[PDB]
Amino acid sequence: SPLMGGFGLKHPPPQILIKNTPVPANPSTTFSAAKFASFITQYSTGQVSVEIE
């Protein structure tokens, strides 16, 4: 039993992981094998709903 309190679970509710997909900004007209350091600045938002029985 967790020492902070609550229900010890071998298989707890899984972790939900979320990311904003990268959106490159204006590549150069000539090829470069280097990594992209420049992206469109941006974020996201929305609603999340949890129902426990």
Binding site: H11, P14, N20, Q42, S44
Partner: protein
Amino acid sequence: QNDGTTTIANNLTSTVQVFTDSEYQLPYVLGSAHQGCLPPFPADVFMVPQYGY
């Protein structure tokens, strides 16, 4: 951000990517009593925490 002003616009084609690990293959951060929970009061808006291990 141009000069001292900031514009925010929809990017309709951008994606957000989401998975849940049901096989428990990542370090499990939950249950460490971290902050960034869904707020107590339903009218609050919260920032999504960053994942690290």
